[PDB]
Design a protein around this ligand. Structure first.
Ligand SMILES: [Mg+2]
Ligand SMILES: [Mg+2]
Ligand SMILES: [Mg+2]
Ligand SMILES: [Mg+2]
Lengths: 354, 41, 49, 111, 52, 146, 80, 95
RNA sequence: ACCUCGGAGCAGAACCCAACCUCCGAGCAGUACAUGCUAAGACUUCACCAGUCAAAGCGAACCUCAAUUGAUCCA
């Protein structure tokens, strides 16, 4: 008995008549590129991608961000071709390239990377870290404003917060120093939240900072509607994610139902859901920036837990599920004595009725 | 006394041991050298 | 077992307890022909002794 | 007469021990095979008699995937590099989709 | 053609492993793990047990 | 009775939702198996380098296929400083730029799965040296299976 | 209470408080727990020997955290 | 075997069974693997460890050895430092 | 004439399957010297014996092959 294939067969549109006059792959690499293209093709048979991939909805993730910057492609391309012509016209550049002694300035590269494709690379980093999934429930925004955030550590030191680097709560005890390049007349909102970190609710996050109605780059004159509480990841709970969100406001907004008290040290009042925040204020502002760091437990967290939050410090431990061990038999026919030790509970001698 | 004698004999052998390792290894690498000589022939 | 024997009054605590008092009070059965060499005191029930 | 001798070996009792959709524990043999009929896929180890065992606790799932050999298997690269262009070889792979989370984060103190 | 040969540790431990060598070869000296000294030490061929 | 704080209400199980969590703790599964094919899928992140005819692209990819951090000569970022986008200098400079992007993304460890001719090529040696001297360790730590 | 532990000298009372902070409660008490036997007499013996080893030692994954900390420095290199 | 002896009218033990097997009081019989001290130069280390294990017996073989031994060999024995004292009883055994 | 072991057909597709049925082979060789130790879970030649694979761990490093074989006692 046979059943016809449900669709196209893989090696089907290859003509088997002129096998010696058909072109061959003579390279493992070339086969590999074709292999991986078929591997990513949809396919009507059962697939590893079917059983192991992430089957997100094809809802075509809604953009919630400020419109893309407009550029003139012809002028930009002409400038770039002329610049490459000058760079190749330099003879010492060809000498350095042939002698393999050339180099590339990383600082300049990073600056214009932040200008050109840094927004999309950050968007992909946020999606990999699952920040859109957990903050906006799937909606994506290209971070189109570079939000520079650092922490004043030591006297001459800063620990930057780029896109998921680790910053300890000792380095995050006080508020960060922020800089967003803006124009006058543009009001803004800065928000710090710890996605993973709520000790009671598994769905909720913790608000750490809610600077609102902010002049412009000036970050000291914005209403402090919730004051910086330093991150507090519990011991043994693993790496938490902390996101500084920057939204560009159109109208001045009234933030009175989201005004946390002054020395607010109660977590039931510091619970936050950015989906509800942006939903209730969607028609007033739009997300513009995203800087995020990863946080673990440090000694300072015993301080935040004991003194600041008037509470005993939560300690958690990873526990792995217990071993299988099939149903024990009366006659374990070809098994060693380690069998009876697998089903033993106590290592100490027992005596029964004696 | 028997245990002390056994442990001391083991101690003397392991004291002489690293030098034994290095010249046995130089003889082995050497044996590779004559093997490559007669395979060069 | 020793505490149970004492509480049921089968072994007198006010006198030196030896193997004879533990075979008379019938708390241990010893078979010298099965190579029994006496009684071993074991730790079970040390927490409520 | 009959100058044909030998041939009296018994059947190897090989083949599939865990079919599709069966629950499997770590260590359990999924198939035994003299040649690589079914190939090791996700979370399925291969023992040196080409046998296939479950590395994780989960559900045995058979699929058909593309076949890219190690670039040191001289025999298989030689075929791939003589294969016509646009031709991807495929094989039948066995996968264990793991059933339980690696662990859970539990409260152990209130210090 | 080949022979099984007892190789005794030179660490004084008395550890002994048995391996094979061609008869027309010389006395074998090897680097093998002695578990009494918990280390890889020299073993030298001290007997021929049989022909394998 | 002692009045409990309304703050010390903790659930008996913490639910960390960070995708990186069990992988930075070393307690997360790596996809073992696939031991008759290549490449191996027993890794959390991997460096994959694509040298086309005109450009060099290097990506750090999760085992999901999700791409974490990338660096290519197709960017004006690397174009405006290189003479050529296909040289040993190109591979080295992509090594330095991705190393910087990895450190800022938190990716300190990954597997590099080369081919023998890639391994014995001098472009890839300069890229691996650039990543190693930029901070990226090209061998992943093992899983605490227990 | 480790602070008011006069049977322990102060030099070592303080080393124990920096070596066993994960065992000091907010009330300043060192807490020791043994559950490796079904006899509380043997568990108490284990706890007392743990205290004794703490005092003696006071009297006298790391690869991962080391590399992560080192790379935290190549970024915290931000001088003003 | 001998079901009734001629001098005492009693059942006899097979001393071959006694010299080869160990009875635990729970009713299990323990044996060594055949060929554990034989041709080891041809055996691989996994096979050698498998041969060095102390393994249990069948229900059929257990009943057969219990019939070939007398009731002296099934009594409870309180030896001084018996290495099988743990295995003389069953724990958590359902059906 | 054969008697033990392995591969193919009979036995087309999980397993199994006989004939003094049709064919082909084995009773090793090569390498290594961690070819150390240990230990979950399994397979199994239709019983038993025997045989097979193996995660984790300790310690190091950074096996090919199809069969290639022989129990107990005893020496
Ligand atoms: Mg046959
Ligand atoms: Mg048959
Ligand atoms: Mg069977
Ligand atoms: Mg292993």
């Amino acid at each position: 008995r046979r059943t016809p294939p449900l669709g196209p067969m893989p090696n089907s549109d290859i003509d088997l008549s002129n096998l010696e006059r058909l072109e061959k792959y003579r390279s493992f690499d070339r086969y590999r590129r074709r292999a991986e293209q078929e591997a990513q093709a949809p396919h009507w048979w059962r697939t590893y991608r079917e059983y192991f991939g992430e089957k997100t909805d094809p809802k075509e993730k809604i953009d919630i961000g400020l419109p893309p910057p407009k550029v003139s492609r012809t002028q930009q391309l002409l400038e770039r071709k002329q610049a490459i012509q000058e760079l190749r016209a330099n003879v010492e550049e060809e000498r350095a390239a042939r002698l393999r002694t050339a180099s590339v300035p990383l600082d300049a590269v990073r600056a214009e990377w932040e200008r050109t494709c840094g927004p999309y690379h950050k968007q992909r980093l946020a999606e990999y870290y699952g920040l859109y999934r957990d903050l906006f429930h799937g909606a994506t925004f290209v971070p189109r404003v570079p939000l520079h955030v650092a922490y004043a550590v030591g006297e001459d030191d800063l620990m930057p917060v780029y896109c998921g680097n680790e910053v300890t709560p000792t380095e995050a005890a006080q508020a960060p120093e922020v800089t967003y390049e803006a124009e006058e007349g543009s009001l803004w909102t800065l928000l710090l939240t710890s996605l993973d970190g709520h000790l009671l609710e598994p769905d909720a996050e913790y608000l750490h900072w809610l600077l609102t109605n902010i002049p412009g780059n000036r970050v000291a004159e914005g209403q402090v509607t919730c004051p910086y509480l330093p991150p507090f990841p519990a011991r043994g709970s693993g790496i938490h994610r902390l996101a500084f969100l920057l939204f560009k406001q159109d109208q001045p907004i009234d933030f009175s139902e989201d005004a946390r008290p002054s020395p607010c040290y109660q977590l039931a009042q510091r619970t936050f859901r950015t989906f509800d925040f942006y939903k209730k204020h969607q028609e007033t502002m739009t997300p513009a920036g995203l800087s995020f760091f990863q946080c673990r437990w440090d000694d300072s967290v015993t301080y935040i837990f004991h003194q600041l939050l008037d509470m005993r410090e939560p300690v958690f431990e990873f526990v792995r599920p217990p071993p299988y061990h099939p149903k024990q038999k009366r006659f374990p026919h070809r098994q060693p004595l380690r069998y009876l030790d697998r089903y033993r509970d106590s290592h100490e001698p027992t005596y029964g009725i004696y | 006394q028997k245990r002390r004698e056994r442990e001391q004999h083991i101690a003397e052998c392991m004291a002489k041991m690293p030098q034994m390792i290095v010249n046995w290894q130089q003889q082995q690498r050497e044996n590779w050298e004559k093997a490559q000589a007669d395979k060069e022939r | 077992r020793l505490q149970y024997l004492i509480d049921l009054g089968r072994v007198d605590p006010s006198q030196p307890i030896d193997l004879t008092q533990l075979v008379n009070g019938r708390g241990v059965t010893i078979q010298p022909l099965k190579r029994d060499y006496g009684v071993q005191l074991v730790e079970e029930g040390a927490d409520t002794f | 007469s009959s100058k044909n001798l030998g041939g009296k070996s018994s059947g190897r009792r090989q083949g599939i021990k865990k079919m599709e959709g069966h629950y499997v524990h770590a260590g359990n043999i999924i198939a035994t095979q003299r040649h690589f009929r079914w190939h090791p896929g996700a979370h399925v180890g291969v023992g040196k008699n080409k046998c296939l065992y479950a590395l994780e606790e989960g559900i045995v799932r058979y699929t058909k995937e593309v076949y890219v050999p190690h670039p040191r298997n001289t025999e298989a690269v030689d075929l791939i590099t003589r294969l016509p262009k646009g031709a991807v070889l495929y094989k039948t792979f066995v996968h264990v989709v793991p059933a339980k989370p690696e662990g859970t984060f539990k409260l152990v103190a209130m210090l | 053609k080949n022979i099984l040969v007892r190789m005794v540790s030179e660490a004084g431990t008395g550890f002994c492993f048995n391996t094979k060598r061609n008869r027309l070869r010389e006395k074998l000296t090897l680097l093998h793990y002695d578990p009494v000294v918990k280390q890889r030490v020299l073993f030298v061929e001290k007997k021929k047990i049989r022909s394998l | 009775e002692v009045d409990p704080v309304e703050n010390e209400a903790v659930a008996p199980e913490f639910t960390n939702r960070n995708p990186r969590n069990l992988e930075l703790l070393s307690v997360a599964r790596k996809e073992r198996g696939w031991r008759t094919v290549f490449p191996s899928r027993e890794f959390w992140h991997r460096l994959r380098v694509i040298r086309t005819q005109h450009h060099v692209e290097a990506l750090v990819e999760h085992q999901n296929g999700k791409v974490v951090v990338s660096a290519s000569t197709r960017e004006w970022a690397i174009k405006k400083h290189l003479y050529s986008t296909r040289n040993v200098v190109a591979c080295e400079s992509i090594g330095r730029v991705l190393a910087q992007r990895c450190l800022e993304a938190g990716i300190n460890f990954m597997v590099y799965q080369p081919t023998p001719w890639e391994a014995a090529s001098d472009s890839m040696k300069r890229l691996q040296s650039a990543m190693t001297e930029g901070g990226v360790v090209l061998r992943e730590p093992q899983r605490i299976y227990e | 209470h480790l602070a008011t532990a006069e049977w322990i000298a102060e030099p070592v009372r303080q080393k124990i408080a920096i070596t066993h902070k994960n065992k000091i409660n907010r009330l300043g008490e060192l807490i020791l727990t043994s559950e490796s036997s079904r006899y509380q007499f043997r568990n108490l013996a284990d706890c007392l020997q743990k205290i004794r080893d703490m005092i003696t030692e006071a009297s006298q994954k790391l690869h991962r955290i080391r590399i992560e900390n080192m790379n935290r420095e190549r970024l915290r290199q931000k001088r003003i | 075997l001998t079901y009734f002896s001629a001098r005492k009218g009693k059942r006899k033990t097979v001393k071959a069974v006694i010299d080869r097997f160990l009875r635990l009081h729970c009713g299990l019989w323990v044996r060594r693997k055949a060929g554990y001290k034989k041709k080891l130069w041809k055996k691989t280390p996994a096979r050698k460890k498998r041969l060095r294990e102390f393994v249990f017996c069948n229900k059929t073989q257990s009943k057969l050895l219990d019939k070939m031994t007398t009731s002296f060999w099934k009594r409870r024995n309180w030896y001084v430092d018996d290495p099988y004292q743990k295995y003389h009883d069953r724990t958590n055994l359902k059906v």
